[PDB]
DNA sequence: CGGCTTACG
DNA sequence: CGTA
DNA sequence: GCCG
């Protein structure tokens, strides 16, 4: 089993959910305590289990797997022997973990913000609503719409959303296209947000497109929160909150809109499709194993000072020496 | 031992 | 810092 | 926490 998540297919459905979820609890807790290295190892170990074809039943099966060492093997060992791991259970029942998970699940709140609020004695969402001076406008929106934003987004919502996004994009720029990315492109049936990638076949036509799209959406009354203020002034990404029509009502939905020039489209498609761990492992592999710098704009050779002109995601995998993984196999 | 994705708002 |  |  190879060491990078971008070297192995990881499907939606896998066989070690109980073991994976426990390691991901420890990964989350490591992040809450500011140990980004420990988070990564626990996430990578959990990902290794997701790629296995069969359930792990004996400790010997962990031999030869990357990212498994004394600590992660002890966690699996306890789960195999007793069905629970005492370290994991102590974490999930701890007030620190429950409060940090509660606060970091708010749109606009990360680990450092949640940790500050925790040290100040805050424990519940109502504690936050009673301290509005501690909140950015972004966090006020995440708190105001928290119940809706914690409701899982379904495929039915995605199709309705893509319709209204395509309408606004079409009114903003003839011939522009809209591509669903993110978890739903990977085959997930639920999500916490919906990601769309927007481009135009003619390079340059997409300049200034996202503000025109956001204005069309605001005019349809569809935007509840938007981070940029528009009638640097230009922007190409918007992580907004939509007022999605429902039968006789509406529901707030997190939506990401990204504009990219068509020359960068395969890199943008690869980037925004995820998963998050897949992307980190792919970019790490690119830099550390191939000496190339990858992001959502391109693939840069710092020695030749040139960008690789890709026409497809397959082109990028091939240039990196990787077997192609379709999006449904990028669920690391 | 040091590294751990890499951008934009 | 937050977003992905 | 684990790898290079
Ligand atoms: Cl990027
Ligand atoms: K958050």
Author numbering: 138 to 368, 382 to 397, 410 to 494
Can I see the authors' text?
Pol μ is capable of performing gap-filling repair synthesis in the nonhomologous end joining (NHEJ) pathway. Compared with replicative DNA polymerase, Pol μ lacks proofreading activity, with an intrinsically high error rate of 10−3–10−5 for dNTP incorporation. Here, crystal structures and kinetics of Pol μ substituting dGTP for dATP on gapped DNA substrates containing templating T were determined and compared.
To investigate the mechanism of dGTP misincorporation on 1-nt gapped DNA, we first solved the binary structure of Pol μ:DNA. This binary complex with template T is almost identical to the published Pol μ:DNA binary complex containing templating A (PDB ID: 4LZG29), except for the interactions of the templating base in the active site. By replacing dA with dT, the templating T interacts snugly with Lys438 and Gln441, which adopts rotamer conformations similar to those observed in the Complex 1 structure. The space between templating T and thumb domain is filled with water and glycerol molecules. Gln441 from minor groove interacts with templating T in our binary complex and undergoes a rotamer change to avoid clashes with incoming nucleotides regardless of whether correct insertion or misincorporation occurred. Gln441 interacts with the unpaired 5ʹ templating T in both binary complex and Complex 1 structures and undergoes a rotamer change toward the finger domain to avoid clashes with base-pairing after incoming nucleotide binding, which is observed in all the normal and misincorporation ternary structures solved by our group and others.
